[PDB]
């Protein structure tokens, strides 16, 4: 079977967190066929917890494991800066290892913030050619949820629009970017377009 | 000392064979199960199969039975991973793992370094830089100059200002995957409105997979 | 297909019920060291039915496979796993030097080297008490007159064939005529009446005529035999009616 | 279906040549007798044959 | 527990008498390719006399 | 050419692990039994066990079953001898042997160079050189100048005269193991009585494990 893991976890330094793992199979040998791995971004994973009632050498006692029924738990007593990594659980009961979705680890959150609107008109160089693209930049907002809607003189237009919501940097806030591709004749056929953020209200 | 060394990064195209290797040293390479794990960019770990160095007893994953073959050379203590008719979805990070002195026979306590396959079949487009002119018709607030990078297939693209100067104010936004498969990002810098073109306010875009050095001011 | 089985003294039994026994999935495995059925033929299990079938799993040092058999004696047979003289089943054992063996030594298996009395068939003694061999009352600690009866194995791949760990699977099924659930992949036909036809309800082959008598069978009763132990009355597995088996003209 | 006979495979997948010698032991004119020598044909006396 | 045995044509016969026949020490030796008895059962030697 | 090379001398303290090695070359390292032989100072040879390069069939001595473990690496053709929780009685000369092309399988026709293993509770300490002044009150006979080396744990110590000059007359005496575990030797040179201090008559004592360069005249 396939294992299920939460998408992400959060925890302040000093407190403890628990990672759930549901879907482990079993056989006539036992029910403790659950192992945990830690993989930092940019390197190979490392075996942290296997045979949850035990643990390998060279691993601090901060990492603990348990299992109740078909649900496994990974208990970490102390959280530090070097603990941010993806933790996967593995079920190796029926002669077949299955890795879960994984949960990236990071610490507690931050207060909410306010999106940007930075709208740039089509450049003169691209206007000289047969191409045009509107660029609306959104940044400085904490809640990673925003949908960009374009309008052409109070008329909604959704032809050729793409938007994502990545993370800028360790500033704990996210960013966004949208591009509206259109012909220069369509650009010069109306007034200046508007970029709507709709983060929490109209902007 | 026990350690696992793998082959370097390999970049090929769909419809071409590939055979990566991962040599293990510091231990008896006859009794420890050697396997391979696939990790897609942004996804979790995926197991494909394991082999036994003593005699060829291969147990492949049900989703990787005939899609990939695994072999090893006991004479030189080196495990191999051969591919045939690669596809666009085969680009991922592949590790080699082995069982430890404690645990089950598929515990995979030790790991290697990592060999990433990087493919897709499309078109490495030369990016076209367009200077994002500031709001010359409305200087209310703070001026913001930038350039538009568009129509380029390889995602890694470095953008600098004045050969790396003007560190403050520059904020680079990650690109977005368009429908045509080409990415596009934008980098701007917040400057005072009265400082339009202080020294040059020139963009600097570099693209290694295509070797295009484009420098344009605004 | 299990990564690790249980110990000899702690052999685990798996109950099987409401199944469609297709033993063809076992033949495609590696050539087993000992595939011997003491009551049936291995190619005939797919054409029969079983009332209660249990699967036992344990790993021994390989050369002790001769002790898992009716009427055998030894450390495993008399102390860990004993088979009755009237055993009716199959024994499956194969080499597992690649799975349950480590080059540094796998110490996850015990065999209860010493025991006070001989073990009875189909019993489990997982007691970890100190075997008091002397006269002084052992206080739960190792001494000159009482040692640990549970000894660990030294499974290493460097040992030749015979000392390697061999996984043994004992299939203990009951072929007695009784209401069963596992009746292979045998398909069903319709029910004719008052004519000389063949009958195969749960593996019982023969020739007779069904009459649908008024015999009152109990829920735990499905077959009825005459003075000569010839089955003259049967309960249909699907329909709860009773049918007699009378010979033809 | 074709076989995948390769020397890397262990016992259980290697090619094994099988030769089946089917005989007919019923009394009949035979021509495949063993390498045994023939003797003289004595008659009218109790001897082995 | 011998380093070298004898030849086939010069097979050495060892007479055994006035001892305790404990065949259990032979099982923990090197695994034998064929342990077949033609007159008794191998597990019954520890209950008979010769 | 067949030859057995071992590791250098290993000096440790009781309660510390040790794993010496002995590499063999010039022959097929898969069928020749490799073993180890202990020889205490002033005592005979003591056999501990043998191993097989193909598969590790270890036949330990009844007095060395769990007291020491033996292993080998077939990939590099090198045998090892691992120790755990060393004691004061473990200091001895250890050899590595192998069977020859003729003889029994435990004949051990070939040997190694020998590894000197010493263990003591005393730690390293730099030697204190004291100049053994000649008999200035009685010049009858031949003058004899020297220096006194004392209070040094490592036994190997090289003593020279005038950076290696004055070869004739110099006679170095082996040291003696004191009760404190520190050795002490003395080196003198026979010179004519009328030649007191010909050029300099200076001692030169070198101690590599402590890196102490002591030069003192007399």
> Measuring CA to CA, how many Å separate B64 from each of B69, B150, F48?
8, 37, 49
**3-state secondary structure (DSSP) of residue B204:** strand
> Burial, B170: exposed, middle or buried (Cβ in 10 Å; 0-12, 13-18, 19+)?
middle
Tell me phi and psi for residue B54, to 5 degrees: -60, -65
Which residues from B are below 8 Å from C when comparing CB atoms? 28, 30-33, 52, 54, 57, 101, 104-106
Tell me phi and psi for residue C26, to 5 degrees: -90, -25
- Do residues B53 and B77 lie in contact, with contact meaning Cβ atoms separated by under 8 Å? yes
| Cα F13 from Cα F118, distance rounded (Å) | 8
Smallest CA–CA distance, residue E24 to chain F, in Å, is: 20
Hey, what's the torsion of the CAs at A39, A45, A47, A49, to 10 degrees? 30
- Do residues C109 and C153 lie in contact, with contact meaning Cβ atoms separated by under 8 Å? yes
Instruction: For strands F45-51 and F34-39, give the pairing.
Output: antiparallel
**3-state secondary structure (DSSP) of residue C26:** helix
> Burial, C239: exposed, middle or buried (Cβ in 10 Å; 0-12, 13-18, 19+)?
exposed
| Cα B154 from Cα F27, distance rounded (Å) | 54
- Do residues C176 and C76 lie in contact, with contact meaning Cβ atoms separated by under 8 Å? no
> Measuring CA to CA, how many Å separate B177 from each of A146, A161, A181, F109?
17, 11, 14, 73
Chains in touch with C (3+ beta-carbon pairs under 8 Å) read: A, B, D, E, F
Comparing CA positions, the residue from C173, C159, C155, C166 lying closest to residue C14 is C173
Q: Does A144 touch chain B (CB under 8 A)?
A: no
- Do residues F45 and F38 lie in contact, with contact meaning Cβ atoms separated by under 8 Å? yes
DSSP state of C152: B
- Do residues C111 and C7 lie in contact, with contact meaning Cβ atoms separated by under 8 Å? yes
Contact check, Cβ <8 Å, B25/F74: no
Smallest CA–CA distance, residue E23 to chain C, in Å, is: 11
**Phi/psi class of residue A167: alpha, beta or left (left: φ > 0; alpha: ψ in -120 to 50)?**
beta
Comparing CA positions, the residue from F58, F3, F2, F14 lying closest to residue F35 is F58
E strand intervals along chain C: 12-16, 34-37, 53-60, 89-95, 131-132, 146-147, 166-173, 196-198, 207-210, 223-225, 231-235, 242-246
Comparing CA positions, the residue from C83, C53, C79, C54 lying closest to residue C66 is C83
| Cα B41 from Cα C65, distance rounded (Å) | 50
Question: Got the DSSP string for F96-163?
Answer: EEE--SSS-TT---B----EEEEE-SPPP---EEEEE---TT---S-EEEEEEEEEES-S--EEEETT
> Measuring CA to CA, how many Å separate C180 from each of C199, C244, F136?
17, 19, 116
For residue F47, the surrounding DSSP H or E stretch is strand F45-51
Smallest CA–CA distance, residue C20 to chain D, in Å, is: 29
Which residues from C are below 8 Å from E when comparing CB atoms? 62-63, 66-67, 72-74, 77, 159-163
**3-state secondary structure (DSSP) of residue E26:** helix
Comparing CA positions, the residue from B58, B98, B48, B105 lying closest to residue B77 is B98
Task: Find, in chain E, the residue whose alpha carbon is nearest to that of F59.
Answer: E1
| Cα A120 from Cα F155, distance rounded (Å) | 82
Q: How many CB pairs under 8 A join B and D?
A: 7
Task: Find, in chain C, the residue whose alpha carbon is nearest to that of D13.
Answer: C30
| Cα A98 from Cα A89, distance rounded (Å) | 8
A182-185, Cβ contacts within 8 angstroms, sequence gap of 24 or more: A182/A132, A182/A133, A182/A134, A183/A130, A183/A132, A184/A122, A184/A127, A184/A130, A184/A131, A184/A132
Q: How far apart are the first and last CA of chain C?
A: 53
- Do residues C232 and C245 lie in contact, with contact meaning Cβ atoms separated by under 8 Å? yes
> Measuring CA to CA, how many Å separate A35 from each of A32, A53, A91, A98, B136?
9, 11, 7, 10, 61
Comparing CA positions, the residue from B148, B120, B115 lying closest to residue B39 is B115
| Cα A100 from Cα A194, distance rounded (Å) | 43
Distant-in-sequence, close-in-space partners of B24: CB < 8 Å, separation ≥ 6? B2, B3, B4, B5, B32, B34, B77, B78, B79, B96, B98
Please count the other Cβ atoms lying within 10 Å of the Cβ belonging to residue B125.
Answer: 18
SS (HEC) of chain A? CCCECCCEEECCCCCCEEEEEECCCCCCCCCCCEEEEEECCCCCCEEEEECCCCCCCCCCCCEEEEEECCEEEEEECCCCHHHCCEEEEEECCCCCCEECCCEEEECCCCCCCCCCCCEECCCHHHHHCCCEEEEEEEEEECCCCCCCEEECCCCECCCCEEEECCECCCCCCEEEEEEEEECHHHHCCCCCCEEECCCCCCC
Instruction: For strands F212-217 and A149-151, give the pairing.
Output: unpaired
Q: Is the dihedral of CA C48, C53, C58, C60 positive or negative?
A: negative
Token pair 């009746």 is at which residue? Answer: C183
| Cα C75 from Cα E27, distance rounded (Å) | 11
Contact check, Cβ <8 Å, A28/C57: yes
What count of Cα atoms within 13 Å lies in the side-chain half-sphere of residue A146? 36
| Cα B107 from Cα B50, distance rounded (Å) | 11
* Residues from chain B contacting residue F74 (CB–CB below 8 Å): 28
What count of Cα atoms within 13 Å lies in the side-chain half-sphere of residue E11? 4
Interface present between C and F (3 or more CB pairs within 8 Å): yes
B136-139, Cβ contacts within 8 angstroms, sequence gap of 24 or more: B139/B193
- Do residues A188 and A194 lie in contact, with contact meaning Cβ atoms separated by under 8 Å? no
- Do residues C196 and C207 lie in contact, with contact meaning Cβ atoms separated by under 8 Å? yes
> Burial, F173: exposed, middle or buried (Cβ in 10 Å; 0-12, 13-18, 19+)?
exposed
Smallest CA–CA distance, residue B83 to chain F, in Å, is: 28
Comparing CA positions, the residue from A82, A108, A126, A97 lying closest to residue A36 is A97
Smallest CA–CA distance, residue C68 to chain D, in Å, is: 25
- Do residues C3 and A93 lie in contact, with contact meaning Cβ atoms separated by under 8 Å? yes
* Residues from chain C contacting residue D11 (CB–CB below 8 Å): 31
Retrieve residue F20's tokens: 């010496």
């Amino acid at each position: 079977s396939a294992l299920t893991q939460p998408p992400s976890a959060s925890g302040s330094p000093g407190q403890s967190v628990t990672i759930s793992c549901t879907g482990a199979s079993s056989d006539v040998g036992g029910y403790n066929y659950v192992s945990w791995y830690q993989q930092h971004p940019g390197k190979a994973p490392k075996l942290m917890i296997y045979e949850v009632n035990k643990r390998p050498s060279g691993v601090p006692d901060r990492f603990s494991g348990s299992k109740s029924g078909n649900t496994a738990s990974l208990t970490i007593s102390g959280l530090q800066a070097d603990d941010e990594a993806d933790y996967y659980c593995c079920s190796y009961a029926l002669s077949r290892v299955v890795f879960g979705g994984g949960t990236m680890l990071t610490v507690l959150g931050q207060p909410k913030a306010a999106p940007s609107v930075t709208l740039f008109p089509p450049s003169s160089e691209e206007l000289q050619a047969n191409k045009a693209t509107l660029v609306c930049l959104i940044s400085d907002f904490y809640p990673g949820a925003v949908t960009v809607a374009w309008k052409a003189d109070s008329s909604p237009v959704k032809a050729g629009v793409e938007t994502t919501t990545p993370s800028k940097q360790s500033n704990n806030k996210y960013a966004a970017s949208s591009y509206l591709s259109l012909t220069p004749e369509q650009w010069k056929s109306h007034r200046s377009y508007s970029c709507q953020v709709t983060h929490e209200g109209s902007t | 000392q026990m350690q696992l060394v793998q082959s370097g990064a390999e970049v090929k195209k769909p419809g071409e064979s590939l055979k990566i290797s991962c040599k293990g040293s510091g231990y008896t390479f006859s009794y420890y199960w050697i396997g391979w794990v696939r990790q897609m960019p942004g996804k979790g770990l995926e197991w494909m199969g394991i082999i036994y160095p003593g005699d060829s007893d291969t147990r492949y994953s049900p989703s990787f039975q005939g899609q990939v073959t695994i072999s090893a050379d006991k004479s030189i203590s080196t495990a191999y991973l051969h591919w045939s008719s690669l596809k666009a979805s085969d680009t991922a990070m592949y590790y080699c793992a082995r069982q430890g002195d404690l645990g089950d026979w598929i515990l995979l306590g030790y790991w290697g370094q990592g060999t990433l396959v990087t493919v897709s079949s499309a078109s490495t487009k030369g990016p076209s830089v367009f200077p994002l002119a500031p709001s010359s018709k409305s200087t209310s607030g703070t001026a913001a100059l930038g350039c538009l990078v568009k129509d380029y297939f390889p995602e890694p693209v470095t953008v600098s200002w004045n050969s790396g100067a003007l560190t403050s104010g520059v904020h680079t936004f990650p690109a977005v995957l368009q429908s045509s498969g080409l990415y596009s990002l934008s980098s701007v810098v917040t400057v005072p409105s009265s400082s339009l073109g202080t020294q040059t306010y020139i963009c600097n875009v570099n693209h290694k997979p295509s070797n295009t050095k484009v420098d344009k001011k605004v | 297909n299990a990564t690790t089985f249980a110990s000899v003294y702690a052999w685990n039994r798996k109950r099987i019920s409401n199944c469609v026994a297709d033993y063809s999935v076992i033949y495609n495995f590696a050539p087993f060291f000992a595939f011997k059925c003491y009551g049936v033929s291995p190619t005939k299990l797919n054409d029969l039915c079983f009332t209660n079938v249990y699967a036992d799993s344990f790993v021994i040092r390989g050369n002790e496979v001769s002790q898992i058999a009716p009427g055998q004696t030894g450390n495993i047979a008399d102390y860990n796993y004993k088979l009755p003289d009237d055993f009716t089943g199959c024994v499956i054992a194969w080499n597992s030097n690649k799975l349950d063996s480590k080059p540094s030594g796998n110490y996850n298996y015990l065999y209860r080297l010493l025991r006070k009395s001989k073990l009875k068939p189909f019993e489990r003694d997982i007691s970890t008490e100190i075997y008091q061999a002397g006269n002084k009352p052992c206080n739960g600690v190792a001494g000159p007159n009482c040692y640990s009866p549970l000894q660990s194995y030294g499974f290493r791949p460097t040992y030749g064939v015979g000392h390697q760990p061999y996984r043994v699977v004992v299939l203990s099924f009951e072929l007695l005529h009784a209401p069963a659930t596992v009746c292979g992949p045998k398909k069903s036909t319709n029910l004719v009446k008052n004519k000389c036809v063949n009958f195969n309800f749960n593996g019982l082959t023969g020739t007779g005529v069904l009459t649908e008598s008024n015999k009152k069978f109990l829920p735990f009763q499905q077959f009825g035999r005459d003075i000569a132990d010839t089955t003259d009355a049967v309960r249909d597995p699907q329909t709860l009616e009773i049918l007699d088996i009378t010979p033809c003209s």
